[PDB]
Amino acid sequence: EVSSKIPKPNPATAMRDRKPLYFLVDDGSNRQQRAATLLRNVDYVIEAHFELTDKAGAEDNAGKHLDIFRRRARAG
RNA sequence: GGAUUGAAACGCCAUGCUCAGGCUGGCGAGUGGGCGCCACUCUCCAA
């Protein structure tokens, strides 16, 4: 894996003088090795329900979104 | 259309099992034993 993220550029100066930008993965300490332990077979069932946000418009109704959700889930 | 301690993340670049060594030297299938004992082509048919 990699050691660090990328920095923000300045579009103006970048083009006004052609300059390459990149991150060099293979260089020195940039390379980092990480181990992991993980599950191998899973299955679950989830129970939940909706609730109205404060910014919601007056026309919004939870049941409508719930029906949309059921449609989408059935259709995959 | 904000936010699954999440969003991105190569095990990678390459190296001869090599050089060589006798299954050899040699040993008798060899000694010896009867196919023998004995038995009618014989009775009669002109040229």
A31 touches strand B (CB under 7 A): yes
Question: CB atoms < 10 A from the CB of A30, how many?
Answer: 13
A62 Cβ partners below 8 Å, 6+ apart?
A50, A51, A52
Structure-determination technique = cryo-EM
DSSP A2: B
Rounded, the Å distance between the CA of A37 and C1' of B20 is 55
Q: How far apart are CA A50 and CA A63, in angstroms?
A: 9
A47 touches strand B (CB under 7 A): no
Strand B, nucleotides < 7 Å from a protein CB: these are: 8-11
Length of chain A in terms of residues written: 76
* A41-70 as b/e: b if 16+ CB within 10 A: eeeeeeeeeeeeeeeeeeeeeeeeeeeeee
Q: How far apart are CA A58 and CA A56, in angstroms?
A: 7
Q: How far apart are CA A51 and CA A35, in angstroms?
A: 40
Q: How far apart are CA A38 and CA A36, in angstroms?
A: 7
